[PDB]
Amino acid sequence: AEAADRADILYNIRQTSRPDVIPTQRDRPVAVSVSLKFINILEVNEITNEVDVVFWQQTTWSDRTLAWDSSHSPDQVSVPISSLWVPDLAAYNAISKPEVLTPQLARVVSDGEVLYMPSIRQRFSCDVSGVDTESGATCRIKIGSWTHHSREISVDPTTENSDDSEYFSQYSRFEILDVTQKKNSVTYSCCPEAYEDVEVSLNFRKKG
Amino acid sequence: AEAADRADILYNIRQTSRPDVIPTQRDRPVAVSVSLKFINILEVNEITNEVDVVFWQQTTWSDRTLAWDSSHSPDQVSVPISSLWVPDLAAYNAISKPEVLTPQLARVVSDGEVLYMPSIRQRFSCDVSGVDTESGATCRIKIGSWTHHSREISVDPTTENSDDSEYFSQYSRFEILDVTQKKNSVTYSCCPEAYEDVEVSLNFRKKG
Amino acid sequence: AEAADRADILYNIRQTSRPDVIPTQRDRPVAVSVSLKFINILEVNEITNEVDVVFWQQTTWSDRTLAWDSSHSPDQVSVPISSLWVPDLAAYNAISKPEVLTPQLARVVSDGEVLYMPSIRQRFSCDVSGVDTESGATCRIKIGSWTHHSREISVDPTTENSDDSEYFSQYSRFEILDVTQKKNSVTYSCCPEAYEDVEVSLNFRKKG
Amino acid sequence: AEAADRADILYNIRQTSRPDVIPTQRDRPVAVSVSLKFINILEVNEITNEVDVVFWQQTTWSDRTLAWDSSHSPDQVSVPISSLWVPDLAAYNAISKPEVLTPQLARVVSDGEVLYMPSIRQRFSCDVSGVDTESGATCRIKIGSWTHHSREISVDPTTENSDDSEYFSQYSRFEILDVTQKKNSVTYSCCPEAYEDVEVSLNFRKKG
Amino acid sequence: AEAADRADILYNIRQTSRPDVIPTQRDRPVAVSVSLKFINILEVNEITNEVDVVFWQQTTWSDRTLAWDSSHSPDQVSVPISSLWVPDLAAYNAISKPEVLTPQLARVVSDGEVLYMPSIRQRFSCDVSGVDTESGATCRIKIGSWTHHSREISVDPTTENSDDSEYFSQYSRFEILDVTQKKNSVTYSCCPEAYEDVEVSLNFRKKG
């Protein structure tokens, strides 16, 4: 006999959780990590500077309100994102809504760590010039919390321990040369607070 | 120990939320301020007089029924628009529904001030003539309450509007020459009362 | 101190509207007036006899179960259509589902009179022949109740007036010559009863 | 002073609605009739053997769990299909999901007879060869229950006979030569039971 | 009089299904079998290495929490998937969301065995090179659980012989030369556990 099973954990999470309440820990912002693992580049237009790509948006953060004693029960459960709070990230230069290609489930660990990694197809406005050259083009995608400023949400790249083209389609007409990520904190007109973002630089080119 | 946290504030807002009730203060109309920050100009057809544009629609208004004492609690919260009343604005010359590219969350201040600023991609019917000339074309976009007349909702350009081209994409095939906002008050045959609107004149041209 | 405010009125409507129940008074059918205000004519094709049109579909009818004494209270409110019964109108020759470009709110008057006027973009299969001539083309659009027969819903064209181009976009590649309506009552092979429709005739042509 | 009105009948149907429960009368299958009233033929590609069609899918069956004494009550009511059980019909050769152009309402008679007649636009994979000839093409469309076998649902062509092109648009680029039906009973490798379908053959040709 | 009817069964399922809870047996992984029956090949593009496929994704697994005594009651029922737990399968190389063409119902047998077989149209990124040769092309489709690792979900190519062109449309411009399945267990850089998938190799070519 155990202390709890998945049904108990999920039941408790659904019964509470509060999807609309940001899990700030006292006076600290929620530390969100986000990185883009590119899977494909389906269309590129050097005249209009538009690209159509697919990527896994690995997203992580902690939500202590989800934690549970796992000394005698499962250590993790897959949870519908509709049942928990998730960062309100947006790509500033996206020109289409994200088309989520995978089941919208996050993975919650008994300590409150949450991983959400949907595969997404989305179009963007970025620098496509040079794509047809050896040095390639460098398309920058900026992602960050849409409505939470720096005192509520911070964004940093996730860690990386693999090739930038690790999961990139070998059948794409393009190939990846380099993928880098840099964090930023920007203040805009509408509001007095600063908003953080991660800038992902996709350096790619048309294959020979 | 505080008086309340985000969970409590959001709970109170959700529980008393009358999304379908315009927050008129007595008999005064709800004063709505609107201004467009252009992000991109994607499709332009001078033959059909049609254009595709991406813009942030900064919308502000006061809803006193949302106010709370923040002396010992958070001063603001991000709230899903489905839990609040929002102006029923519509672009009169739009020929496509608004494609909202950002999380649909409004920011609510403890005094009742609300800010909703979605990034929208929408197609419009306007004058594209001259877009390929030095003077460029001037496309006018009209926005106002669809069902609330002047005595229930007033719409005015945002007083501070200096960032109209601040976020415009340097990668667009077009460039902005000027953005002007103006207010109107029209009476249409269908009905007796007058409906206010804001007219945004986008003077732009094709690079080259 | 008044008798009631919008919050009270909308609360009562939401609690008792009965959206699935046609508001027939005794045994008299619900008199639904339908009037199309043409806003734009977009992608016309004389080869396939298809056309894209944008119009305000002014729809009016009365629902006595919505009336309230507005002696000392608002005499009108905007209500989400999901909270009211609305006629099940359908465009017989439409070849695409209606794209509603406006907030789906109807205006309900204290005496029970209801007005719903969505701006719609929809494609139709009609006669485009002669669109390039001085006499132009005459595209007929048929609209009527899909499941309520003549004894339950009566559709009547509102003899609004002339000036059918009052709200027609000056930027369209086409122009409106004239708009006329007429009432039909058809018995289909599926069923014994008769279903009525208003047939709007749109005579238009490409601007010379 | 009647026995009941529409509000009472629709209240009882909604309250005891078992939308996910096939209403088999004891151990007898549910007898479903279906005939397709072709309204239009919009896209025809003889290269890829694909066609875009608009048709009224006249569907009828009996659900005795809906009946009510109509001595002094309405003889019938229109009911949102989401509140009733409907056959899980699927076109085996469709290559796009059905686009329902009409309000999703079914008509229920006091005896329990039900009629659901959506107007549908759908793309199909069929023989388009000889569409440009005088003999025309014969595109066969197969429709049957997707998850209910012959002992639970039987499917038969509607006995209702009428001009094939009876409601076919006169503005289509094509015209109908003839429409014949055929009832099949097939056994598929996945499952041990037999599944029924109605095969509708659309003999049409392009206009000269 | 029986022990139970479909109404009772579906009611118990609706009340106790727990759709967000994977039905792991005691502590073993849920054995999921997957088999793709190809129905059609459309929109092939050898330049971009993309193809549109229509297939029945035969999916089976066991959920003993659904079992019931059918000695005096129906042995099976069709259940809306929203009322059941279903494997969170995803096609790794799909570049469009799956378009489900059939009613989203699964078949649940009284012993607890579940079958879900939606017909799906979806675009893929794969090797289309050689489609115009006698050897044809070989497009591999990889499908596995997105958030459940090998210890929670195992995926296996159904063990059974079946003509690959059994249900393939005779009107497609392409034909199937052969179809083979391969099982895999993969560890992704994001996570420590291994995730299983089945890779289906579709060898097809353009018909002469």
Ligand SMILES: N=C1NCCN1Cc1ccc(Cl)nc1
């Ligand atoms: N995160 C961003 N990007 C541009 C402006 N902004 C901040 C912001 C703040 C509040 C609301 Cl409701 N919307 C946006």
Ligand SMILES: N=C1NCCN1Cc1ccc(Cl)nc1
């Ligand atoms: N804002 C506008 N534009 C055209 C007509 N109108 C006013 C209006 C009034 C009432 C209802 Cl239900 N809908 C629209």
Ligand SMILES: N=C1NCCN1Cc1ccc(Cl)nc1
């Ligand atoms: N309004 C029309 N047009 C064609 C047939 N019809 C009448 C009708 C009657 C009942 C149901 Cl459920 N659906 C449609």
Ligand SMILES: N=C1NCCN1Cc1ccc(Cl)nc1
């Ligand atoms: N319509 C038919 N005939 C044979 C198979 N099939 C499709 C089908 C049957 C049962 C389930 Cl759960 N899913 C899909």
Ligand SMILES: N=C1NCCN1Cc1ccc(Cl)nc1
């Ligand atoms: N099955 C796959 N493919 C890529 C990563 N992954 C595993 C995985 C783990 C956790 C969450 Cl929330 N999402 C996906």
Ligand code: NA
């Ligand atoms: Na454990």
Ligand code: NA
């Ligand atoms: Na300005």
